[PDB]
């Protein structure tokens, strides 16, 4: 049967961010997204300026009592959790977490810890960053932090790419059994090239692809599209490395149209093809 | 390129209606959709039972006046709208269509202006109708009514094909230039099957697909699938036969597919592959 994701994460009505950067890439590759938005905000948060608002923690509780009462929440594979409108909404979602799991104890939790990186355009609440380091982390089944939420969710700084893999380790041990890194940036070997590291705690594969340049903007709901495609790759019986290798492609893929178009909002349906059979390959290098 | 619309519909966290039904296939036929969700539902309100909230037509307001503040708008090529909840809601909705069309003059208002079933009789809130009679109607550039919605915008009945396009440019006349009987049901050719009309001024086209048997449960969303799909194929430049028999293929794939796998949900994502390319062709014909 197709996987079937329920997506508790943000949802822009203009452009892409969250659930909005990835729902359809996660639909385009054949599994089903449930989208549970935790905001309906008019644009994401780079332009500096957006209306809307954020949706109650009760309400996100309440929506999963709805999927519960058309006995219908056995079916979820997976819960994913993105970027958070307050911490009040992490409690909620453990609650969530529990009760999928009650209902299919072989559903995972994925939380993509997104943090605040106002410097990159991206402004969260206050409070969310403090609930992922003491609730989400150890919760979670696969946790994927870039390079800044991976520090703060190790209490550490991280430098390098063997640091990198202790660090995601450290995690490992509280909680999780999977860890991206979503994106090493600094503690890559090259800051010319996007980096990331899909570690377990006997495995571990990093990956290397190109940059494409967007000026000094830097593009907003990679991770989201990143993290969401994983997942499906990992519920539908992928690899380590297969899993790693299909998301570094696709997410490829959208940024070469993206840039083709002149476009830095994430042009997901122009590369829609391309996310489900990617024409370039990177390939995933094994580590020890 | 591509072609933008704004598309303020129901959200289902859950399953399939209004924006949850009509996304997903906008986007897999390569048409950007900004859905500005009108509720966040556990699921359709034809289950009888369902839990979340409704978004205040005030909210839908205040997200367009985001996408104007940071100068988008104007990249809007058309509004798309289909149940609505109240008819403050639809006003709401023509304050948007005129702000969309005063900052892109070439957007076009696609209403689908739902009001009842056939066998279910009336199933909007009282306001609706006379909104879409008085309101929805001579503002829209492209209307979809099936049978029972064309007589109450025309006031009168409406018997057979002859007098289906009669009726449809009485409402042309009023304002839109393309009608979209979405379901001719009694005043088709032949019942027992499925028939729609797609009516100009100049121009009346036929088509017919069968019958799908879902017997005391049928899947909802239908309606919103055939009006979504249409507006992108008329977006996209194609012709009245070409829009018609792409959506009337791609709807019917959608159908089988939902049926083969027993389901009640309408399985958009399942059949996806067909939604962009049915392998069924039916033939449209010209009507003199």
């Not at 063997?162 to 995601?168: D, G, I, R, T």
């Given at each position: 049967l197709m996987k079937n994701i329920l997506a508790i994460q943000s949802h822009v009505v203009y452009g892409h961010a969250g659930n909005s950067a990835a729902e359809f890439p996660m639909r385009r590759l054949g599994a089903n997204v449930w989208p549970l938005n935790t905001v309906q905000f008019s644009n994401h948060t780079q332009y500096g300026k957006w209306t809307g608002c954020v949706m109650p923690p009760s309400h996100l509780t309440e929506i999963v009592q709805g999927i519960a009462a058309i006995d219908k929440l056995h079916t979820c594979d997976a819960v994913?959790?993105?970027y958070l409108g307050s911490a009040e909404q992490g409690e909620h979602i453990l609650g969530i977490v529990r009760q999928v799991k009650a209902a299919n104890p072989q559903a995972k939790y994925f939380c993509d810890p997104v943090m605040g990186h106002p410097e990159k355009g991206c402004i969260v609440a206050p409070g969310v960053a403090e609930f992922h380091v003491r609730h989400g982390l150890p919760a979670s089944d696969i946790i994927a932090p870039n390079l800044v939420e991976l520090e703060i969710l190790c209490e550490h700084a991280v430098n390098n790419v063997?640091?990198?893999?202790?660090?995601?380790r450290e995690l490992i041990a509280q909680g999780p059994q999977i860890v991206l890194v979503k994106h090493?940036?600094?503690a890559g070997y090259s800051r010319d090239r996007f980096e990331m590291l899909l570690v377990t705690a006997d495995e571990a594969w990093h990956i290397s692809r190109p940059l494409v340049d967007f000026g000094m903007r830097q593009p907003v709901g990679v991770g989201d599209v990143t993290s969401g495609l994983l997942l499906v790759k990992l519920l539908q019986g992928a690899t380590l490395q297969e899993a790693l290798e299909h998301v570094t492609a696709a997410v490829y893929?959208?940024?070469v149209t993206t840039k083709?178009?002149?476009e830095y909002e994430l042009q997901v349906v122009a590369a829609q093809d391309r996310i489900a059979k990617p024409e370039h390959y990177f390939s995933a290098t094994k580590l020890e």
């Open positions: 994913l959790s993105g063997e640091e990198a893999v202790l660090a995601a090493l940036a600094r893929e959208i940024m083709a178009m002149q």
